[PDB]
Each structure stands twice: as C-alpha cells, then as structure tokens.
Symmetry: C2
Subunit: 74 residues, 2 copies
C-alpha cells in the first residue's frame, strides 16, 4: 500500500522539499497504468503511500520547461 | 486574491485555447512564487497546477541543470 505506486514510479528524479509530516514535493518519471511515461511534479506521502495535488508534464511541456530553465540560468 | 507578476513561459497549447504556463504569481499580496498551471484564454479562468516555493524551484533548476550536464 501502495506497491502500485512503486510499479508506476519509474525514476525518482528530484526531491524539492519535505514538510513536518514527511510529505515531499517530488519530480518523478511515471507511467500511470501502463501509459507512456511522463514527468510528474507532485506532493507524496513518506513512503509514497498516497499522492497529493500536482501536475504531469507531457514530454513537449517538459522540454519547454527545460529550455526555459536553461536560458533562465544563462 | 492572486496577481500574475510575470508570464515566464507557455509550455503547451490547447485546441480549446488553454495553455500550461510557468508564471510568477503573488497570492494575497505576498512575495511571488513560481506557478505551473493550466489557464484558459486571457487567463479568464484558472485550472489545475502547482505552486513552487523559492527553495523548491531552486532544487528543480539544479536538477534540470544536471540532466543537461552542469
């Protein structure tokens, strides 16, 4: 509970923050239910037992986010 | 309630007009935060998205930095 999340999370890419209850805002690469993998930015309970609110990035959005973050860093 | 202080980038585009955008947003007049979210045309309506603190956005930029190489 949930070993389902463990299967869907393909790569844990970044932990952005953690709160006093152990929840973390995370960038992960995720396949929801066998769908094409996507980057996912979202709050997760301590052992990924439950997810909170967040957003998925299609690969086109993630490249645009990435081109932006790069040029916006020199 | 909220104010968009800068529109930093549009990541994606709807057929129905909606865009996924990275913006700087001040909530209730507090210092702005980066915000990744879906917006209807003209920002007429706010959709689903997520706010990032300064520390969260810094870690994200560093991570993305690595994935390039730096």
């Amino acid at each position: 509970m949930k070993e389902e999340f463990s299967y869907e999370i393909l790569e844990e890419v970044a932990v952005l923050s953690e709160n006093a209850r152990g929840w973390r805002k995370e960038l992960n690469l995720i396949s929801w239910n066998g769908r094409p993998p996507k980057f996912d930015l979202r709050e997760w309970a301590p052992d990924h037992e439950k997810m909170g609110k967040g957003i998925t990035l299609t690969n086109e959005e993630f490249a645009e986010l990435s081109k932006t973050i790069k040029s916006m860093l020199e």
